Amino acid sequence: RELAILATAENLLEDRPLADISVDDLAKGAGISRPTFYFYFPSKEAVLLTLLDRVVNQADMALQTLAENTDRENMWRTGINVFFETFGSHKAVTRAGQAARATSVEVAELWSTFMQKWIAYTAAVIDAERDRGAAPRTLPAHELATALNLMNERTLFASFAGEQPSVPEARVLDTLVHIWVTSIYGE
Amino acid sequence: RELAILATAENLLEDRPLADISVDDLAKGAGISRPTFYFYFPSKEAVLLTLLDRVVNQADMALQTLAENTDRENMWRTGINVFFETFGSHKAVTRAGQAARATSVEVAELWSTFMQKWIAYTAAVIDAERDRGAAPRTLPAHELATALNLMNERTLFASFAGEQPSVPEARVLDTLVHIWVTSIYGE
Numbered sequence A, B: 001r002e003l004a005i006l007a008t009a010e011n012l013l014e015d016r017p018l019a020d021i022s023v024d025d026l027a028k029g030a031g032i033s034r035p036t037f038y039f040y041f042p043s044k045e046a047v048l049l050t051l052l053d054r055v056v057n058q059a060d061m062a063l064q065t066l067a068e069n070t071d072r073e074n075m076w077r078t079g080i081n082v083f084f085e086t087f088g089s090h091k092a093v094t095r096a097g098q099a100a101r102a103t104s105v106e107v108a109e110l111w112s113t114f115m116q117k118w119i120a121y122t123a124a125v126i127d128a129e130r131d132r133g134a135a136p137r138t139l140p141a142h143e144l145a146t147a148l149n150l151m152n153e154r155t156l157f158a159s160f161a162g163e164q165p166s167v168p169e170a171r172v173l174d175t176l177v178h179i180w181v182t183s184i185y186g187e
């Protein structure tokens, strides 16, 4: 029933913005009354927050699975691909979740927390690559990590929403891997 | 008087969001009545659009001045620096203008037009660098241009707004030049 509210919201968000989805459409879709909805979620905005929180955590867990477990270009491609596949499978939640950063402090703070985590892990892997002699000591690892992660956030999300301008979705993984591998390994 | 409305809006936007600025605050600030304001601008949103349109065009003209007129790293640094200095001098208009992309089709379409222009010029310069034998034929120039331009938009604007996470403003030019020069010249 919680699940049916979440699935209904994900479905309707594929059609239209969260401003055009009412608690009645979410209730209707989950086969419950509007007061019954209020027992599971305080708002349609909390439904979006929860949807976003699962996509982010699904991306984070898939990155942890890689971390616990090739050539350097393929190492980076597999990591970036976790975010391409995870967000790319949940485009309506990606789009809605990004738009809510402007209006929800909880969505802004959720996004900020996982970006800080994914930057810190990028920096740790760049540092390990520098310690093993594979990557040169160029920029501060954490500053290079930050720019590469903000690049991916902006570029993946533009490609997914078909923005003008954007890298076509079928070219965006290759585009990002090239810039990551050349900026991490290049002198 | 048009100028005094524009200067007043730029000033108040340094303090608070456009939602917290009323046509009376703009009128008051420009020493005119509210009906007199309506003779210059249909809305406070049109005032933001015009402010954004001058900053974008000031950036574009400064890029044209370079184009009509060193080592490859310094060539790219001077180009990126046009955007760092121009937007960095107008942070409240940058911030407000970026936020209005969500709510104004005219702000979205203005931003899209100049991004397409600046990407096309980046691609043209990468192509000329490839034709002269200085840069290798790696990614499609226009796809590499797109990702590098979206990186800069996201990274410069995060640094300016002090977002978490962000590259510190005093490190962001060096960060972006490294990733540009290594991704453009690297194999």
Ligand SMILES: CCOC(=O)Cc1nc(-c2ccc(S(=O)(=O)NCCC(C)C)cc2)cs1
Binding pocket: A066, A067, A069, A075, A076, A078, A079, A080, A083, A084, A087, A115, A118, A119, A121, A122, A125, A148, A149, A150, A152, A153, A156
């Ligand atoms: C073998 C173990 O090492 C690896 O797997 C390679 C690694 N990949 C990452 C990583 C890749 C992409 C992104 S990001 O920049 O794309 N996400 C934020 C942006 C949005 C998309 C959430 C963030 C972190 C860190 S280490």
Ligand SMILES: CCOC(=O)Cc1nc(-c2ccc(S(=O)(=O)NCCC(C)C)cc2)cs1
Binding pocket: B066, B067, B069, B075, B076, B078, B079, B080, B083, B084, B087, B115, B118, B119, B121, B122, B125, B148, B149, B150, B152, B153, B156
């Ligand atoms: C000697 C002649 O050649 C040159 O000057 C070097 C050149 N620089 C550019 C250029 C630099 C940065 C950006 S961008 O990516 O920073 N702006 C969009 C994003 C936001 C910031 C507006 C866009 C284009 C093109 S060619």
